[PDB]
GROMACS .gro file of N, CA and C in nm:
model
  372
    1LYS      N    1  -1.221   1.422  -1.678
    1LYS     CA    2  -1.150   1.276  -1.729
    1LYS      C    3  -1.039   1.287  -1.837
    2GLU      N    4  -1.016   1.176  -1.859
    2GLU     CA    5  -0.864   1.159  -1.952
    2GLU      C    6  -0.820   1.039  -1.907
    3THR      N    7  -0.790   0.927  -1.978
    3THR     CA    8  -0.709   0.838  -1.904
    3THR      C    9  -0.535   0.834  -1.875
    4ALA      N   10  -0.506   0.711  -1.801
    4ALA     CA   11  -0.390   0.763  -1.782
    4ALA      C   12  -0.280   0.780  -1.900
    5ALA      N   13  -0.302   0.682  -2.007
    5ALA     CA   14  -0.230   0.665  -2.120
    5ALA      C   15  -0.201   0.784  -2.193
    6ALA      N   16  -0.385   0.877  -2.183
    6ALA     CA   17  -0.354   0.948  -2.261
    6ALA      C   18  -0.295   1.117  -2.185
    7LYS      N   19  -0.284   1.071  -2.065
    7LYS     CA   20  -0.234   1.191  -1.970
    7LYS      C   21  -0.063   1.164  -1.972
    8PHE      N   22  -0.003   1.039  -1.979
    8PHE     CA   23   0.103   1.037  -2.053
    8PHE      C   24   0.143   1.087  -2.177
    9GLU      N   25   0.059   1.071  -2.245
    9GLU     CA   26   0.125   1.141  -2.385
    9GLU      C   27   0.099   1.280  -2.380
   10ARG      N   28  -0.010   1.368  -2.288
   10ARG     CA   29  -0.019   1.521  -2.280
   10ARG      C   30   0.117   1.535  -2.213
   11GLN      N   31   0.119   1.499  -2.130
   11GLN     CA   32   0.293   1.514  -2.001
   11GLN      C   33   0.404   1.520  -2.096
   12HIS      N   34   0.407   1.404  -2.147
   12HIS     CA   35   0.556   1.358  -2.197
   12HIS      C   36   0.604   1.318  -2.337
   13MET      N   37   0.519   1.317  -2.448
   13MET     CA   38   0.500   1.331  -2.577
   13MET      C   39   0.512   1.428  -2.695
   14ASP      N   40   0.636   1.442  -2.738
   14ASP     CA   41   0.627   1.560  -2.849
   14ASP      C   42   0.713   1.527  -2.961
   15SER      N   43   0.628   1.441  -3.042
   15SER     CA   44   0.700   1.398  -3.160
   15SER      C   45   0.725   1.504  -3.240
   16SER      N   46   0.690   1.621  -3.247
   16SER     CA   47   0.682   1.740  -3.324
   16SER      C   48   0.807   1.813  -3.394
   17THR      N   49   0.888   1.791  -3.315
   17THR     CA   50   1.042   1.831  -3.328
   17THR      C   51   1.137   1.725  -3.286
   18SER      N   52   1.267   1.721  -3.377
   18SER     CA   53   1.352   1.592  -3.341
   18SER      C   54   1.429   1.631  -3.217
   19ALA      N   55   1.451   1.779  -3.180
   19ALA     CA   56   1.532   1.819  -3.088
   19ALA      C   57   1.481   1.980  -3.036
   20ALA      N   58   1.410   1.997  -2.903
   20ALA     CA   59   1.355   2.113  -2.878
   20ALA      C   60   1.505   2.215  -2.892
   21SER      N   61   1.449   2.264  -3.003
   21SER     CA   62   1.551   2.368  -3.027
   21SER      C   63   1.577   2.497  -2.932
   22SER      N   64   1.629   2.596  -2.903
   22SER     CA   65   1.665   2.677  -2.790
   22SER      C   66   1.603   2.683  -2.671
   23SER      N   67   1.603   2.799  -2.620
   23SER     CA   68   1.571   2.807  -2.498
   23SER      C   69   1.469   2.833  -2.461
   24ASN      N   70   1.339   2.845  -2.506
   24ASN     CA   71   1.173   2.911  -2.511
   24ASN      C   72   1.105   2.767  -2.500
   25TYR      N   73   1.148   2.655  -2.500
   25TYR     CA   74   1.091   2.526  -2.531
   25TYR      C   75   0.957   2.476  -2.409
   26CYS      N   76   1.103   2.505  -2.296
   26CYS     CA   77   0.994   2.451  -2.199
   26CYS      C   78   0.896   2.557  -2.134
   27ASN      N   79   0.944   2.678  -2.126
   27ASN     CA   80   0.822   2.775  -2.117
   27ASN      C   81   0.688   2.751  -2.165
   28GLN      N   82   0.698   2.752  -2.264
   28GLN     CA   83   0.581   2.728  -2.411
   28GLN      C   84   0.509   2.583  -2.388
   29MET      N   85   0.576   2.491  -2.350
   29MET     CA   86   0.521   2.364  -2.372
   29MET      C   87   0.479   2.287  -2.260
   30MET      N   88   0.508   2.361  -2.114
   30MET     CA   89   0.499   2.296  -1.999
   30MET      C   90   0.326   2.401  -1.970
   31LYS      N   91   0.328   2.496  -2.043
   31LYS     CA   92   0.206   2.586  -2.039
   31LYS      C   93   0.097   2.497  -2.139
   32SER      N   94   0.148   2.501  -2.269
   32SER     CA   95   0.056   2.447  -2.359
   32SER      C   96  -0.017   2.278  -2.327
   33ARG      N   97   0.071   2.268  -2.251
   33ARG     CA   98   0.008   2.105  -2.221
   33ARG      C   99  -0.036   2.108  -2.060
   34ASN      N  100  -0.102   2.203  -2.023
   34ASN     CA  101  -0.087   2.221  -1.894
   34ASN      C  102  -0.047   2.150  -1.759
   35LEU      N  103   0.068   2.198  -1.780
   35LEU     CA  104   0.144   2.131  -1.666
   35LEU      C  105   0.164   2.258  -1.535
   36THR      N  106   0.124   2.364  -1.569
   36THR     CA  107   0.127   2.495  -1.487
   36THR      C  108   0.005   2.562  -1.455
   37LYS      N  109  -0.098   2.452  -1.411
   37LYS     CA  110  -0.236   2.502  -1.432
   37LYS      C  111  -0.278   2.558  -1.284
   38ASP      N  112  -0.243   2.462  -1.183
   38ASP     CA  113  -0.275   2.429  -1.057
   38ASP      C  114  -0.168   2.508  -0.978
   39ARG      N  115  -0.029   2.452  -1.015
   39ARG     CA  116   0.105   2.513  -0.964
   39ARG      C  117   0.185   2.457  -1.126
   40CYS      N  118   0.342   2.546  -1.082
   40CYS     CA  119   0.443   2.519  -1.207
   40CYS      C  120   0.460   2.363  -1.134
   41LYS      N  121   0.452   2.284  -1.205
   41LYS     CA  122   0.504   2.140  -1.206
   41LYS      C  123   0.682   2.157  -1.257
   42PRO      N  124   0.732   2.127  -1.111
   42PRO     CA  125   0.861   2.136  -1.105
   42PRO      C  126   0.978   2.120  -1.223
   43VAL      N  127   0.965   1.962  -1.240
   43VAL     CA  128   1.044   1.881  -1.323
   43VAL      C  129   0.964   1.812  -1.418
   44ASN      N  130   0.958   1.799  -1.546
   44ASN     CA  131   0.890   1.730  -1.667
   44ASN      C  132   1.007   1.722  -1.780
   45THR      N  133   0.980   1.608  -1.851
   45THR     CA  134   1.022   1.543  -1.923
   45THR      C  135   0.975   1.505  -2.087
   46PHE      N  136   0.971   1.562  -2.182
   46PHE     CA  137   0.930   1.542  -2.289
   46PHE      C  138   1.003   1.436  -2.378
   47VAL      N  139   0.972   1.352  -2.481
   47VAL     CA  140   1.003   1.259  -2.560
   47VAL      C  141   0.979   1.287  -2.674
   48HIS      N  142   1.088   1.339  -2.800
   48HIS     CA  143   1.091   1.322  -2.924
   48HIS      C  144   1.104   1.224  -3.008
   49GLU      N  145   0.996   1.136  -2.992
   49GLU     CA  146   0.983   1.013  -3.080
   49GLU      C  147   0.865   0.959  -3.112
   50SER      N  148   0.839   0.872  -3.189
   50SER     CA  149   0.727   0.832  -3.201
   50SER      C  150   0.648   0.753  -3.114
   51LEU      N  151   0.515   0.768  -3.113
   51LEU     CA  152   0.450   0.720  -3.021
   51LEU      C  153   0.455   0.564  -2.977
   52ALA      N  154   0.460   0.464  -3.114
   52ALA     CA  155   0.500   0.364  -3.125
   52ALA      C  156   0.624   0.326  -3.058
   53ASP      N  157   0.744   0.373  -3.065
   53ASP     CA  158   0.883   0.369  -3.023
   53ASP      C  159   0.891   0.366  -2.869
   54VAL      N  160   0.806   0.504  -2.830
   54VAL     CA  161   0.767   0.491  -2.681
   54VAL      C  162   0.686   0.387  -2.605
   55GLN      N  163   0.587   0.347  -2.692
   55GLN     CA  164   0.510   0.228  -2.632
   55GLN      C  165   0.561   0.105  -2.639
   56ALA      N  166   0.662   0.045  -2.747
   56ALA     CA  167   0.763  -0.015  -2.741
   56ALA      C  168   0.858  -0.050  -2.605
   57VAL      N  169   0.902   0.039  -2.552
   57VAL     CA  170   0.939   0.033  -2.448
   57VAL      C  171   0.859  -0.041  -2.316
   58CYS      N  172   0.770  -0.041  -2.325
   58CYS     CA  173   0.704  -0.123  -2.197
   58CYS      C  174   0.740  -0.292  -2.242
   59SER      N  175   0.813  -0.361  -2.374
   59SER     CA  176   0.875  -0.475  -2.402
   59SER      C  177   1.023  -0.448  -2.409
   60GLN      N  178   1.070  -0.381  -2.343
   60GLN     CA  179   1.174  -0.369  -2.338
   60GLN      C  180   1.243  -0.398  -2.228
   61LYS      N  181   1.365  -0.327  -2.153
   61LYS     CA  182   1.447  -0.356  -2.017
   61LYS      C  183   1.398  -0.365  -1.918
   62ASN      N  184   1.338  -0.440  -1.857
   62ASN     CA  185   1.263  -0.458  -1.735
   62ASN      C  186   1.330  -0.400  -1.600
   63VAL      N  187   1.344  -0.296  -1.533
   63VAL     CA  188   1.397  -0.221  -1.428
   63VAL      C  189   1.300  -0.209  -1.325
   64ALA      N  190   1.360  -0.189  -1.230
   64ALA     CA  191   1.330  -0.126  -1.093
   64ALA      C  192   1.271   0.011  -1.114
   65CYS      N  193   1.153   0.056  -1.073
   65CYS     CA  194   1.074   0.173  -1.083
   65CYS      C  195   1.169   0.273  -0.949
   66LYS      N  196   1.158   0.414  -0.945
   66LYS     CA  197   1.214   0.472  -0.816
   66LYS      C  198   1.149   0.459  -0.718
   67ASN      N  199   0.998   0.457  -0.724
   67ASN     CA  200   0.928   0.451  -0.630
   67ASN      C  201   0.922   0.246  -0.574
   68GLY      N  202   0.989   0.191  -0.628
   68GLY     CA  203   1.015   0.002  -0.557
   68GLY      C  204   0.910  -0.072  -0.634
   69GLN      N  205   0.809   0.021  -0.734
   69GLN     CA  206   0.781  -0.106  -0.794
   69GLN      C  207   0.831  -0.133  -0.913
   70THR      N  208   0.776  -0.290  -0.980
   70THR     CA  209   0.860  -0.347  -1.057
   70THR      C  210   0.829  -0.305  -1.222
   71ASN      N  211   0.743  -0.227  -1.234
   71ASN     CA  212   0.674  -0.223  -1.356
   71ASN      C  213   0.749  -0.091  -1.438
   72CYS      N  214   0.901  -0.082  -1.433
   72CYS     CA  215   0.953  -0.002  -1.529
   72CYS      C  216   1.022  -0.071  -1.650
   73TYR      N  217   1.036   0.009  -1.714
   73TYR     CA  218   1.109  -0.039  -1.842
   73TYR      C  219   1.202   0.078  -1.926
   74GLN      N  220   1.350   0.029  -1.937
   74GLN     CA  221   1.437   0.098  -2.003
   74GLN      C  222   1.484   0.097  -2.144
   75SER      N  223   1.424   0.196  -2.213
   75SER     CA  224   1.460   0.224  -2.394
   75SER      C  225   1.573   0.128  -2.395
   76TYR      N  226   1.596   0.045  -2.506
   76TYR     CA  227   1.731  -0.044  -2.528
   76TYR      C  228   1.832   0.106  -2.589
   77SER      N  229   1.771   0.181  -2.709
   77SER     CA  230   1.834   0.315  -2.783
   77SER      C  231   1.804   0.410  -2.705
   78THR      N  232   1.896   0.523  -2.709
   78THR     CA  233   1.879   0.636  -2.661
   78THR      C  234   1.789   0.691  -2.754
   79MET      N  235   1.730   0.816  -2.682
   79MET     CA  236   1.586   0.866  -2.749
   79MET      C  237   1.641   1.033  -2.738
   80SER      N  238   1.582   1.093  -2.834
   80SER     CA  239   1.550   1.249  -2.802
   80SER      C  240   1.483   1.271  -2.683
   81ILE      N  241   1.521   1.374  -2.632
   81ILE     CA  242   1.424   1.430  -2.489
   81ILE      C  243   1.447   1.538  -2.476
   82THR      N  244   1.393   1.611  -2.343
   82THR     CA  245   1.380   1.772  -2.333
   82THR      C  246   1.373   1.755  -2.185
   83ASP      N  247   1.427   1.799  -2.078
   83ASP     CA  248   1.427   1.830  -1.956
   83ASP      C  249   1.366   1.951  -1.924
   84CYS      N  250   1.248   1.977  -1.879
   84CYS     CA  251   1.188   2.087  -1.831
   84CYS      C  252   1.241   2.093  -1.685
   85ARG      N  253   1.279   2.199  -1.630
   85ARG     CA  254   1.349   2.207  -1.508
   85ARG      C  255   1.280   2.336  -1.460
   86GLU      N  256   1.208   2.381  -1.346
   86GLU     CA  257   1.150   2.516  -1.317
   86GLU      C  258   1.277   2.597  -1.243
   87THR      N  259   1.293   2.708  -1.301
   87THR     CA  260   1.394   2.809  -1.223
   87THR      C  261   1.380   2.893  -1.102
   88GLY      N  262   1.475   2.926  -1.038
   88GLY     CA  263   1.501   2.961  -0.896
   88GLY      C  264   1.387   3.090  -0.888
   89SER      N  265   1.364   3.155  -0.996
   89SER     CA  266   1.304   3.276  -1.020
   89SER      C  267   1.122   3.258  -1.043
   90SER      N  268   1.143   3.168  -1.108
   90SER     CA  269   0.969   3.102  -1.136
   90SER      C  270   0.875   3.137  -1.040
   91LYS      N  271   0.768   3.236  -1.093
   91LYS     CA  272   0.667   3.245  -0.938
   91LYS      C  273   0.548   3.245  -1.061
   92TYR      N  274   0.500   3.153  -0.988
   92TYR     CA  275   0.335   3.119  -1.036
   92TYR      C  276   0.256   3.196  -1.011
   93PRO      N  277   0.184   3.255  -1.141
   93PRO     CA  278   0.159   3.165  -1.241
   93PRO      C  279   0.252   3.172  -1.349
   94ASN      N  280   0.342   3.291  -1.361
   94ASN     CA  281   0.451   3.292  -1.488
   94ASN      C  282   0.570   3.178  -1.415
   95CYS      N  283   0.511   3.088  -1.481
   95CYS     CA  284   0.611   2.966  -1.464
   95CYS      C  285   0.749   2.989  -1.527
   96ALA      N  286   0.831   2.937  -1.539
   96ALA     CA  287   0.967   2.947  -1.597
   96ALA      C  288   1.083   2.833  -1.550
   97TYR      N  289   1.144   2.781  -1.673
   97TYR     CA  290   1.210   2.644  -1.712
   97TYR      C  291   1.309   2.690  -1.780
   98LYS      N  292   1.445   2.621  -1.728
   98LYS     CA  293   1.522   2.571  -1.826
   98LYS      C  294   1.539   2.493  -1.894
   99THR      N  295   1.535   2.487  -1.999
   99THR     CA  296   1.521   2.373  -2.154
   99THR      C  297   1.663   2.306  -2.175
  100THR      N  298   1.653   2.186  -2.131
  100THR     CA  299   1.788   2.066  -2.177
  100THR      C  300   1.720   1.972  -2.249
  101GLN      N  301   1.797   1.984  -2.352
  101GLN     CA  302   1.815   1.866  -2.480
  101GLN      C  303   1.914   1.771  -2.466
  102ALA      N  304   1.894   1.663  -2.453
  102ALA     CA  305   1.947   1.522  -2.491
  102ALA      C  306   1.929   1.420  -2.509
  103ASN      N  307   2.022   1.322  -2.498
  103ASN     CA  308   1.989   1.184  -2.605
  103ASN      C  309   1.996   1.063  -2.498
  104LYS      N  310   1.921   1.045  -2.435
  104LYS     CA  311   1.954   0.942  -2.289
  104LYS      C  312   1.831   0.834  -2.345
  105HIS      N  313   1.860   0.727  -2.240
  105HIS     CA  314   1.763   0.615  -2.248
  105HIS      C  315   1.660   0.657  -2.146
  106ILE      N  316   1.534   0.619  -2.196
  106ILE     CA  317   1.448   0.675  -2.111
  106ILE      C  318   1.380   0.545  -2.023
  107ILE      N  319   1.318   0.588  -1.897
  107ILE     CA  320   1.271   0.480  -1.817
  107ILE      C  321   1.097   0.532  -1.801
  108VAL      N  322   1.017   0.429  -1.826
  108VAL     CA  323   0.832   0.477  -1.811
  108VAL      C  324   0.809   0.344  -1.737
  109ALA      N  325   0.745   0.414  -1.676
  109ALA     CA  326   0.598   0.265  -1.595
  109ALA      C  327   0.536   0.246  -1.683
  110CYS      N  328   0.459   0.088  -1.694
  110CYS     CA  329   0.379   0.080  -1.812
  110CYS      C  330   0.228   0.022  -1.720
  111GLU      N  331   0.147   0.013  -1.757
  111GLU     CA  332   0.005  -0.078  -1.698
  111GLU      C  333  -0.103  -0.077  -1.781
  112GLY      N  334  -0.199  -0.174  -1.750
  112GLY     CA  335  -0.303  -0.192  -1.807
  112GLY      C  336  -0.318  -0.278  -1.936
  113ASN      N  337  -0.437  -0.326  -2.007
  113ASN     CA  338  -0.449  -0.367  -2.110
  113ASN      C  339  -0.510  -0.269  -2.206
  114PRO      N  340  -0.467  -0.257  -2.318
  114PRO     CA  341  -0.293  -0.280  -2.360
  114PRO      C  342  -0.221  -0.208  -2.267
  115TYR      N  343  -0.102  -0.278  -2.273
  115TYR     CA  344   0.001  -0.251  -2.176
  115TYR      C  345   0.082  -0.114  -2.208
  116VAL      N  346   0.069  -0.025  -2.198
  116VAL     CA  347   0.104   0.101  -2.255
  116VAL      C  348   0.181   0.186  -2.109
  117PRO      N  349   0.275   0.303  -2.153
  117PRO     CA  350   0.298   0.416  -2.064
  117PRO      C  351   0.247   0.482  -2.015
  118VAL      N  352   0.220   0.479  -1.836
  118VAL     CA  353   0.165   0.581  -1.771
  118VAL      C  354   0.236   0.637  -1.681
  119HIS      N  355   0.346   0.645  -1.677
  119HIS     CA  356   0.440   0.760  -1.577
  119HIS      C  357   0.583   0.777  -1.637
  120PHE      N  358   0.659   0.860  -1.654
  120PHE     CA  359   0.778   0.891  -1.689
  120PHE      C  360   0.854   0.891  -1.570
  121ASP      N  361   0.967   0.808  -1.536
  121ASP     CA  362   1.046   0.757  -1.419
  121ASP      C  363   1.177   0.846  -1.457
  122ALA      N  364   1.248   0.831  -1.534
  122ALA     CA  365   1.380   0.904  -1.520
  122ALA      C  366   1.413   0.894  -1.684
  123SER      N  367   1.543   0.948  -1.687
  123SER     CA  368   1.640   0.931  -1.797
  123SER      C  369   1.768   0.895  -1.742
  124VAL      N  370   1.826   0.817  -1.824
  124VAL     CA  371   1.978   0.780  -1.791
  124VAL      C  372   2.070   0.757  -1.924
   0.00000   0.00000   0.00000
């Protein structure tokens, strides 16, 4: 078990550095956070801001989700993030990822009471 909000936290929050420094980060983080246990999750984004800062995005700019639902929200401010994208040479279980740091606006789907992030939709 694990709640949807917890799993979002496990899969998408990394408040601990300001910016994934160097090239090792995704290889290490996708593993530490269990995103490579069944298969190599092929794309995953970590957000380097506070929990309250990301939770606040659920009251920010409402936008359509990529799947067509209406419960997505874009941050007004840019945020520090790290895209992890699986390489072409990556063979499970030794999953390999290119680490890309950026500052972009995030788009999260939010649900529940309390109304909190449960998916990472996109960055823009």
